[PDB]
From a paper:
Furthermore, the X-ray structure of FakA_C shows that it consists of two subdomains that are structurally related to FakB. The FakA_C structure consists of two α/β subdomains encompassing residues 328 to 444 and 445 to 548 (numbering with respect to full length FakA). Subdomain 1 contains a four-stranded parallel β-sheet flanked by two α-helices on one side and three on the other. Subdomain 2 contains a mixed six-stranded β-sheet flanked by two α-helices on one side and subdomain 1 on the other side. The two FakA_C subdomains are each related to segments of FakB1. Subdomain 1 is structurally related to the N-terminal segment of FakB1, but the FakB1 EDD domain differs in having a 35 residue α/β insert that is not present in the canonical EDD structure. Subdomain 2 of FakA_C is structurally related to the FakB1 C-terminal segment. The structural elements in FakB1 that are missing in FakA_C contribute to the FA binding tunnel that is not present in FakA_C. The FakB1 tunnel is formed by a crevice at the interface of the N- and C-terminal segments, and the three insertion sequences come together in the FakB1 three-dimensional structure to form the top of the FA tunnel. When these structural elements are missing in FaKA_C, all that remains of the FA binding tunnel is an open crevice on the FakA_C surface. Analytical ultracentrifugation demonstrates that FakA_C binds FakB, and site-directed mutagenesis confirms that a positively charged wedge on FakB meshes with a negatively charged groove on FakA_C.
Residue numbers in the entry:
A (entry chain A), B (entry chain A): 316 to 548
Write the structure that this text describes.
């Protein structure tokens, strides 16, 4: 859903030496991505995905010498790779396949690090960090062939539905029961606008009991739609 | 729950050259295990787990020359290893940690194979096959700290709760959504006494859509309590 007239392509065009280009799915993630180091946000989930030439134009207009591209959607990986090949800039693609995966990869971005150091750390995150999210059904919906009734909570791992229940705590603890293992070391939790403090507190207490060795790192995100983003190292 | 008087220790004492010793959790699995090659079933989930000497006695009374022990419970692994060390027989432990894992390991047992060939294949199954089950809450219950209301269906992977819902199809398809991956090759389904044919048919149709490359191998089990056992190779 967008407003009538010309739909913005993405964020304000800044001039930068190293462009950190992230695709949003049009659900209110831009603040978070900019906070984490993104320089250019491209709006995704329009009818047409961002094209090869859409990404080339962001890279060229930014006047960057180097770029890191996070498609955050498996459908946008080809356009990103094609763009990276075309441009004069030294451009690399971190092959993130979801918004939570993009968040996890941006934890590893360091503005002081070299392009190659950032590439290696962010690419490792896609392979070795488990990303997921908690949301809810604003209307009856189908994910992965599973029918979810309006108002149900939904636990997702890498955007696949794994749990759903009318009860939020039950949904999120089942989600985390699969995301966490006895050898997990760090769980990052990013709290959305609609999260309930009593759920968050009960969830943390559950983690501490069931997975007593995991470090729980909580941050405020303020995102709509997703009560939590989770990342397990 | 057992009947008054002396509670049976396990199945009929047979004399065999190679004993295949499996622990039941006292929920109606003996038929299935015997079908699959078990020679001796020890009853588990009494107050006290089977002891080292309980297992030694089964091995000694069977007059076996060789034995394979499947504890099917992490609490019984030490007794099994201690027994295997004590007996004259050449005894090996396959370190199964649940009943579904024991089932998966028994798929690999071949009465014509050597002890070492069976050991290797069955041990590989514990490491490389994903086992799980679908059940339901006969009363309000807590698994892994998660409260489940009476009548809810429950999806388990390696005995950890991952999904639960009043709707059976939703629960089992969410379970399978996590058990199956794009590169899964074979799903074995063992149908319990209480399974519903309409659920089974809808579940199979869902698998075929979402995971079109997986081979689905269905067998009748007839077990109580677990509508399905699942094994993913």
């Amino acid at each position: 859903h967008h407003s009538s007239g010309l739909v913005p392509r993405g964020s304000h065009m800044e001039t930068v030496e190293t462009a950190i280009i992230t695709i949003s799915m049009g659900e209110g993630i831009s603040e978070i991505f900019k906070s984490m180091g993104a320089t250019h946000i491209i709006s995704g989930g329009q009818t047409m995905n961002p094209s090869t030439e859409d990404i080339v134009k962001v890279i060229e207009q930014s006047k960057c010498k180097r770029a890191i591209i996070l498609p955050n959607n498996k459908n946008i990986l080809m356009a990103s790779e094609q763009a990276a090949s075309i441009v004069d800039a030294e451009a690399v693609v971190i092959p993130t396949k979801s918004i939570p995966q993009g968040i996890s990869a941006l934890f590893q971005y360091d503005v002081d690090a070299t392009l190659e150091e950032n590439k290696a750390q962010m690419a490792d995150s896609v392979n070795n960090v488990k990303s997921g999210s908690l949301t809810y059904a604003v209307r009856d919906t189908k994910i992965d062939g599973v029918e979810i009734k309006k108002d149900a909570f939904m636990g997702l791992i890498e955007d696949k539905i794994v749990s759903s229940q009318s009860d939020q705590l039950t949904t999120v603890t089942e989600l985390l029961n699969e995301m966490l293992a006895e050898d997990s070391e760090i769980l990052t939790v990013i709290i959305g606008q609609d999260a309930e403090q009593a759920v968050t507190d009960n969830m943390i207490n559950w983690i501490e009991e069931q997975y007593p060795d995991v470090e729980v790192e909580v941050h405020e995100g303020g995102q709509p739609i997703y009560q939590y983003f989770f990342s397990v190292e």
